[PDB]
Amino acid sequence: RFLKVKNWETDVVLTDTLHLKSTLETGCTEHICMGSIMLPVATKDQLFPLAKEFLDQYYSSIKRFGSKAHMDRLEEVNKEIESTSTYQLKDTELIYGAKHAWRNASRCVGRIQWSKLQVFDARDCTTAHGMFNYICNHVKYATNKGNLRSAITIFPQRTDGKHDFRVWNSQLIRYAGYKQPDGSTLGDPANVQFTEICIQQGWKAPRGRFDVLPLLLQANGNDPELFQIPPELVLEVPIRHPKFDWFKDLGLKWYGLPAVSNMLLEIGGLEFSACPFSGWYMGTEIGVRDYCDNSRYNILEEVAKKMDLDMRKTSSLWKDQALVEINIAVLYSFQSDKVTIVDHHSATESFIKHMENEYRCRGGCPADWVWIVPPMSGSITPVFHQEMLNYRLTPSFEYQPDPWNTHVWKG
Amino acid sequence: RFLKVKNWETDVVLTDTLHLKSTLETGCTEHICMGSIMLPTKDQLFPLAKEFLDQYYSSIKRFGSKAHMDRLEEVNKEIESTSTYQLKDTELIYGAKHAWRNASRCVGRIQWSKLQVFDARDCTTAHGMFNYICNHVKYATNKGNLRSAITIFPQRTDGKHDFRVWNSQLIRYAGYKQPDGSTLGDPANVQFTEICIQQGWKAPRGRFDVLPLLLQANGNDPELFQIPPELVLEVPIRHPKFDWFKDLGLKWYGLPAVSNMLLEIGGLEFSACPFSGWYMGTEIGVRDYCDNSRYNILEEVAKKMDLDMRKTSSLWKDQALVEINIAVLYSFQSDKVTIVDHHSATESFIKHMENEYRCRGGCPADWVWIVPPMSGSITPVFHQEMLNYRLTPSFEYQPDPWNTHVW
Numbered sequence: 001r002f003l004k005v006k007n008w009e010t011d012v013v014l015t016d017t018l019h020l021k022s023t024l025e026t027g028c029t030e031h032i033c034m035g036s037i038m039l040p041v042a043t044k045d046q047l048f049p050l051a052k053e054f055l056d057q058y059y060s061s062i063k064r065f066g067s068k069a070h071m072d073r074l075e076e077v078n079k080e081i082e083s084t085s086t087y088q089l090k091d092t093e094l095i096y097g098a099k100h101a102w103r104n105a106s107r108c109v110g111r112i113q114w115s116k117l118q119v120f121d122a123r124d125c126t127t128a129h130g131m132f133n134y135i136c137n138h139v140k141y142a143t144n145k146g147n148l149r150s151a152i153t154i155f156p157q158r159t160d161g162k163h164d165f166r167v168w169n170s171q172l173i174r175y176a177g178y179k180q181p182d183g184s185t186l187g188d189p190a191n192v193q194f195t196e197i198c199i200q201q202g203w204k205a206p207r208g209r210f211d212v213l214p215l216l217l218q219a220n221g222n223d224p225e226l227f228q229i230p231p232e233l234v235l236e237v238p239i240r241h242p243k244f245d246w247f248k249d250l251g252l253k254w255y256g257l258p259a260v261s262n263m264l265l266e267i268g269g270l271e272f273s274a275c276p277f278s279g280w281y282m283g284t285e286i287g288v289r290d291y292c293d294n295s296r297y298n299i300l301e302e303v304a305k306k307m308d309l310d311m312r313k314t315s316s317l318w319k320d321q322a323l324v325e326i327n328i329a330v331l332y333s334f335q336s337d338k339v340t341i342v343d344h345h346s347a348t349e350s351f352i353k354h355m356e357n358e359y360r361c362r363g364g365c366p367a368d369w370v371w372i373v374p375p376m377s378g379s380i381t382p383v384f385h386q387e388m389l390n391y392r393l394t395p396s397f398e399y400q401p402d403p404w405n406t407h408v409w410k411g
Numbered sequence: 412r413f414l415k416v417k418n419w420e421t422d423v424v425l426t427d428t429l430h431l432k433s434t435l436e437t438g439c440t441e442h443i444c445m446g447s448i449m450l451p452t453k454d455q456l457f458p459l460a461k462e463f464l465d466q467y468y469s470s471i472k473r474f475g476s477k478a479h480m481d482r483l484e485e486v487n488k489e490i491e492s493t494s495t496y497q498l499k500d501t502e503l504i505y506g507a508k509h510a511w512r513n514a515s516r517c518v519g520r521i522q523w524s525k526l527q528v529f530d531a532r533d534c535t536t537a538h539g540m541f542n543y544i545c546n547h548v549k550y551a552t553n554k555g556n557l558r559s560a561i562t563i564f565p566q567r568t569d570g571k572h573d574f575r576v577w578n579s580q581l582i583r584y585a586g587y588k589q590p591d592g593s594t595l596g597d598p599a600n601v602q603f604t605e606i607c608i609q610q611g612w613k614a615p616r617g618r619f620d621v622l623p624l625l626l627q628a629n630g631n632d633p634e635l636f637q638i639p640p641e642l643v644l645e646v647p648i649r650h651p652k653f654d655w656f657k658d659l660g661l662k663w664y665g666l667p668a669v670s671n672m673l674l675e676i677g678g679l680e681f682s683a684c685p686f687s688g689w690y691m692g693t694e695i696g697v698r699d700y701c702d703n704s705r706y707n708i709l710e711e712v713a714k715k716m717d718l719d720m721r722k723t724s725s726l727w728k729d730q731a732l733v734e735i736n737i738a739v740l741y742s743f744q745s746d747k748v749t750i751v752d753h754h755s756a757t758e759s760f761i762k763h764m765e766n767e768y769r770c771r772g773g774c775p776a777d778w779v780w781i782v783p784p785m786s787g788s789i790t791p792v793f794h795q796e797m798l799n800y801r802l803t804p805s806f807e808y809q810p811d812p813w814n815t816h817v818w
């Protein structure tokens with residue numbers, strides 16, 4: 001079956017055959033679409049077929065499908081599975097696997113870069129202190145004094161599900177949130193819970209509006225342990241505006257390195273529950289979501305007062321006006337300090353080129369329109385007008401429950 | 412069976428049971444989501460009628476009463492004899508209100524039960540259609556105090572005697588391809604404009620020429636008609652801060668009136684059913700004015716604003732977008748023509764959803780369409796999970812008649 005997608009701005013039609021490979025479920029049915037729903041121990045039995053499918057993919061990618069080396073690898077993995085109930089990936093397979101999980105991430109607009117990904121193999125790691133060291137090196141390499149480089153660090157795979165490696169942080173770098181008795185929140189409201197957990201684990205909170213959180217690291221199923229990332233390793237950018245001199249007095253800053261640390265990486269049926277990865281920001285992530293969401297820093301009102309906008313009625317579009325200014329400020333501040341950032345116009349234009357290329361060379365590109373279209377100025381970006389098909393390919397990045405919900409405390 | 416939808420900003424969770432009454436297919440499968448694809452007999456007619464009549468009689472709390480069963484036998488008999496049937500006026504009104512209620516891509520549904528239904532099922536000619544349409548336009552415009560309305564022409568018979576309005580909307584602006592190779596006026600209507608000209612329309616060849624109506628009655632060739640200009644309320648576009656805004660030469664019409672869709676009630680097909688409401692400001696200010704394949708005025712406006720157009724990262728397009736949208740709303744408000752901004756419309760829609768979940772067990776909603784084409788995440792709908800499914804009665808798309816009609 002061939003499926004077509006059309007761009008309604010350019011009339012370009014593309015043909016997807018790749019979706020035929022898709023194994024997993026979407027959440028939708030012939031009678032209901034769950035396209036806007038945010039979230040819609042493996043055995044020997046299920047494991048070899050997952051391993052085979054992955055090695056067939058890997059050996060096709062290197063143009064050695066059906067070779068002796070291909071056949072020998074299948075038998076060796078099969079034998080390792082019957083012997084030990086699991087198997088170990090080669091370095092090369094691990095690299096290919098991690099790159100492909102990114103290549104397959106349908107909610108990621110930054111995928112044009114998928115094949116430049118620095119893979120750090122941390123599968124010899126045994127302790128939380130070892131994790132902290134691996135994570136510091138990742139941050140330093142990825143930050144690169146502002147010239148950001150994509151990277152992922154891969155800790156040991158799940159075994160019985162009782163010995164998981166986890167990074168308890170949702171991102172490697174984030175700011176604390178503190179609920180006051182009067183119901184107001186100081187810092188980032190998204191991190192209130194995680195911040196309480198840290199404090200309870202013995203973190204001494206400085207209790208300001210931008211306190212970088214400590215790392216909370218679990219190795220081999222043990223109780224997690226706290227670490228402060230060295231501050232010379234945390235690149236931050238004070239936010240100012242190219243025309244509004246008062247913008248700086250809002251006291252805003254943000255960190256330069258977006259690094260997601262709470263996803264599960266699946267490769268050939270193996271589960272990597274700690275696999276922190278990082279790229280660089282698209283401006284709207286900070287300026288639209290982090291600063292302007294009502295449940296986040298929520299600065300729209302304050303910024304609009306300072307611009308003296310008419311706030312008596314929504315139809316003055318004061319919210320929209322202040323929103324664009326904050327986003328100019330974010331981009332300007334990053335560019336002036338030579339910290340890599342991409343604006344939403346440029347990122348979306350690159351994505352369309354990436355998608356066309358993927359359709360030609362790969363037979364498709366799974367994409368989640370709800371997520372790809374930026375949270376401001378939707379239809380002035382070319383992705384708004386692009387039909388997309390969403391489907392699940394492996395290797396993949398998946399969500400997993402927050403560890404404080406599942407962890408067995410040892411004391 | 413029971414499905415939950417969460418709002419991530421407010422933590423409100425709703426439970427959807429209404430989806431279980433869906434019959435039509437979505438285009439998705441368990442292996443693929445098509446949520447962003449724009450277009451994904453006697454025997455057939457009776458279950459359809461029975462399903463419609465059951466929901467009707469239940470809506471007036473007479474499910475399974477004497478009247479209910481009686482109507483079912485009467486429709487059954489008429490189907491058995493004539494191969495079709497006729498809706499009672501009450502059913503036609505209910506079916507139209509519900510097709511709007513069920514329109515998953517419409518953010519304006521809080522208003523669904525206040526719809527004026529004009530029954531035009533006695534119409535026989537294009538001149539008659541023209542009269543009904545003018546009456547619809549004058550009624551709906553109401554000197555700027557807009558009122559929602561639908562006019563419903565005779566249902567389909569053999570499919571060779573279709574009533575059709577060939578316009579996509581009752582009121583739209585002409586578009587002309589030029590020697591230069593550029594486009595004057597609205598490029599979305601270049602083809603339609605040409606069909607009007609090959610029908611003998613004398614085009615003023617301007618940037619805002621109201622198109623004639625092209626009306627097909629009973630399967631015949633369509634005929635041209637000019638709407639009386641005094642019936643077409645228009646708004647000159649000016650800006651509350653920027654004096655120079657007036658000089659761009661911009662205006663828009665007050666009445667949004669979709670005229671190319673098909674209304675399905677009880678298995679009966681109404682191929683001509685123009686309906687109208689009132690604008691959300693972004694439809695004009697973001698889509699009509701700023702789409703690259705439309706009026707595409709971004710470059711011009713950013714110019715008058717002396718913005719830095721060197722690099723995309725100065726957000727010049729975004730700054731200009733906002734001003735333009737302020738201007739559209741300001742103009743309509745100053746002229747007392749009903750309009751709603753995207754903030755107010757999406758807040759009403761969240762309220763409507765809450766109403767529908769408690770009263771009806773759900774609300775079918777297409778997030779890709781409900782979320783405004785600007786400032787998405789600062790509107791509450793962005794943070795609202797929605798379930799999309801197809802309920803009947805419904806509005807459906809149909810082929811452009813010029814690809815189908817036999818001249």
Ligand code: HEM
Pocket residue numbers: 102105107108109110111113117150151152263277278279280281282285342347371397
């Ligand atoms: C190189 C620059 C990159 C840019 C500009 C970028 C852009 C983005 C953006 C804007 C999102 C949406 C996140 C949200 O709104 O919550 C996203 C999601 C995602 N990206 Fe990227 N990305 C980049 C690199 C990467 C890398 C290196 C990986 C992994 C190797 C990755 C994998 C993912 C995944 C798995 C998601 C889904 C997150 C979720 O569902 O919560 N991306 N990307």
Ligand code: HEM
Pocket residue numbers: 511514516517518519520522526559560561686687688689690691694751756780806
């Ligand atoms: C009265 C105020 C109304 C507002 C503010 C409103 C708002 C909108 C908007 C913004 C769209 C999306 C159109 C697009 O982006 O192309 C839409 C679509 C739609 N609306 Fe409404 N609406 C209103 C009344 C109505 C009425 C009276 C009906 C019919 C009785 C209706 C039925 C529909 C349908 C069927 C669609 C989908 C059309 C398509 O797919 O092209 N709406 N509405």
Ligand SMILES: Cc1cc(N)nc(C[C@H]2CNC[C@H]2OCCNCCc2cccc(F)c2)c1
Pocket residue numbers: 038039110258259260277278279280281282285399
């Ligand atoms: C690698 C990378 C590069 C980049 N530019 N941006 C990113 C996403 C990060 C940063 N800016 C947002 C954050 O995204 C990670 C969290 N994403 C939403 C998680 C979520 C919450 C609730 C329900 C769900 F289903 C999912 C990663």
Ligand SMILES: Cc1cc(N)nc(C[C@H]2CNC[C@H]2OCCNCCc2cccc(F)c2)c1
Pocket residue numbers: 449450519667668669686687688689690691694
């Ligand atoms: C009744 C009403 C009120 C309102 N405020 N707004 C409206 C939508 C009108 C106005 N502003 C746009 C137009 O919408 C009608 C055309 N809609 C898209 C047609 C289409 C093309 C190609 C593929 C598709 F799947 C669909 C109706």
Ligand SMILES: C[C@H](O)[C@H](O)[C@H]1CNc2nc(N)[nH]c(=O)c2N1
Pocket residue numbers: 035036037038370371372419793794795796797
């Ligand atoms: C309900 C809705 O699906 C949810 O708010 C989504 C919408 N699109 C998104 N898109 C991105 N990139 N990130 C998000 O967090 C969301 N949130």
Ligand SMILES: C[C@H](O)[C@H](O)[C@H]1CNc2nc(N)[nH]c(=O)c2N1
Pocket residue numbers: 008384385386387388446447448449779780781
């Ligand atoms: C490809 C994509 O589905 C298409 O551009 C859609 C997206 N969302 C939309 N939303 C509305 N309200 N109107 C539209 O025309 C569209 N276009």
Ligand SMILES: [Zn+2]
Pocket residue numbers: 028032033034035439443444445446
């Ligand atoms: Zn779907």
